[PDB]
Each structure stands twice: as structure tokens, then as C-alpha cells.
Design a protein around this ligand. Structure first.
Ligand code: O55
Ligand code: ZN
Length: 257
């Protein structure tokens, strides 16, 4: 099984998942002197229905908030896309201390955490499982989280963690619109990339917001106090789950601004 420790972590993923050394891997460092402004990029449009929120799950290396994805109640449109993409999940990545924790970096700068809002191409495919391995199958919005003031918009998420403290626990998580977590401006960078952990499919069009959102040192501590072990075993806090940045291999990061 893969993870983030020294024996099963990102530097070893290539043994079971050779795509880890591929040409479209994520995350990346966005060098702003090398980005290309593309006037053809449209604004990002998100329209999410809070009734699609379903469940929060401790998946061992992280926690996931999942959404009902049987129809187009919650969709992402615009940006580089001609297809509509259906929301299915959001989750976070974080690091061992405040000085790192984001997955993407901007001009070498590491942030404290990163929010991922993930969608699948329902115009072309019939399910997440079909879409997840297709080059145009997934769209993920990344938001860099800068340590500073406590972010009240995270409250429902943080309040839910006490009920999913150990691996495999899950609980209803309803009536929540994750567009409330996005920054005020949706100016973005986009590039073709991958899932940031196994199976590492090169199926993701990334949308990285220029504006960060805030998170406090104590809110990050709540993430790190989640446990990767099953109930009854020795407690193993989820200290970190961010992958190092990967080579661009000639890809172009486009800017909407
Ligand atoms: N950090 S991230 O880059 O935003 C990120 C990382 C991982 C994921 N993973 C995901 O969504 N689904 C798992 C793989 N697809 C389902 C699948 C796989 C194999 C078989 Br067999 C059947 C299946 O249904 C999403 C976003
Ligand atoms: Zn992620």
C-alpha cells in the first residue's frame, strides 16, 4: 500500500506506478515569468447545489468530502473547457509544519495547505470511474492556503472531523456548497497534469487560483490530528500528505489574467 512515509511515499510510488515519472505529472511549480496569457480562456463558472453534499470519510492518508454525482446539479464550466464537469469531491493537502504543505508552488513559494475541488467530464463519460483515466476526464480546482487568520468558511468541515478520527470512519455531510471556500477572484492558471497521488493518472486539467485563501495555525493542527490508523490501534497522526512538485517536461502553464 502507498502512503507518504519514507518507505511508501512519493519517491517510491514509481515502483508500482511508473506513470509517476511521466510527462504530465502534478503538482508543479508555477514560474510566473514563464506563464502564457491566453485571451481565449473564459472565466471559471461554478454552480454547486448544497443538496449534493453527501459524506465525509477518513481515507487513511487524508479525508474526503463526497458529493452526489448522478446529475448536473453541481457543475464547473468555462475556463479552458467546452464541456461541463460534474463536482464529485473536495479535500485538502497539508504538511508537517506551517512552512510547507501545499502541493503546487508559485515562484518557488510553498504555502501551508491546498484545497482541491474535483470534477469529472459528464459531457463525454458516464461515470467518475470511466472518466478518471481519460486525458480530458477530470478537472480539479486548486486553491493555495496561506497561514494567517482563521478561516470561518472551514467551520463545518473542521467540526466534522471529530466523528471520523480514524481510518475508515465516515459520516453524513450535507447541505454544503464548496464554492464558499473559493477565493473572491477566480483568476487562474491552467495546465495539463495528473492526480497527485496513486494511481497518478494523467487525466487532470488543473485550475490553480491566483488568490490564496487563509487558514490558521490551529485549523491546520486539526487536519494533522486526524489519525491514519484504524480504531484501537496505536494512534498515527496524519502529519502530511503533499507530493513534491514535478518537472514540467515542456508543458505550458497558461494564465487567464
Ligand atoms: N489530489 S487530486 O490530484 O485532486 C486527486 C487524486 C486522486 C483522485 N482519485 C479519484 O478520484 N478516483 C480514484 C481513481 N479513479 C477511480 C477508479 C480507479 C481504478 C478502478 Br479499477 C476503478 C475506479 O473507479 C482524485 C483527485
Ligand atoms: Zn488532492
Amino acid at each position: 500500500d502507498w502512503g507518504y512515509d519514507d518507505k511508501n511515499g512519493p519517491e517510491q510510488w514509481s515502483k508500482l506506478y511508473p506513470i509517476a515519472n511521466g510527462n504530465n505529472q502534478s503538482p508543479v511549480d508555477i514560474k510566473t515569468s514563464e506563464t502564457k496569457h491566453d485571451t481565449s480562456l473564459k472565466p471559471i463558472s461554478v454552480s454547486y447545489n448544497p443538496a449534493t453534499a453527501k459524506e465525509i470519510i477518513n481515507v487513511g492518508h487524508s479525508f474526503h468530502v463526497n458529493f452526489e454525482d448522478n446529475d448536473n446539479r453541481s457543475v464547473l464550466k468555462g475556463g479552458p473547457f467546452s464541456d461541463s464537469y460534474r463536482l464529485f469531491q473536495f479535500h485538502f493537502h497539508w504538511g508537517s509544519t506551517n512552512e510547507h504543505g501545499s502541493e503546487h508552488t508559485v515562484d518557488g513559494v510553498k504555502y501551508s495547505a491546498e484545497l482541491h475541488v474535483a470534477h469529472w467530464n459528464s459531457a463525454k463519460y458516464s461515470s467518475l470511474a470511466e472518466a478518471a483515466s481519460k486525458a480530458d476526464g477530470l478537472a480539479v480546482i486548486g486553491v493555495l492556503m496561506k497561514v494567517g487568520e482563521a478561516n470561518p468558511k472551514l467551520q463545518k468541515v473542521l467540526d466534522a472531523l471529530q466523528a471520523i478520527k480514524t481510518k475508515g470512519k465516515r459520516a453524513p455531510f450535507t447541505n454544503f456548497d464548496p464554492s464558499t471556500l473559493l477565493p473572491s477572484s477566480l483568476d487562474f492558471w491552467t495546465y495539463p497534469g495528473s492526480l497527485t497521488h496513486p494511481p497518478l493518472y494523467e487525466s487532470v486539467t488543473w485550475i490553480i487560483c491566483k488568490e490564496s485563501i487563509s487558514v490558521s495555525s490551529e485549523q491546520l493542527a486539526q487536519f494533522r490530528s486526524l489519525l491514519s490508523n484504524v480504531e484501537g490501534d496505536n494512534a498515527v497522526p496524519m502529519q502530511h500528505n503533499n507530493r513534491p512538485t514535478q518537472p514540467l517536461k515542456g508543458r505550458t502553464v497558461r494564465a487567464s489574467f
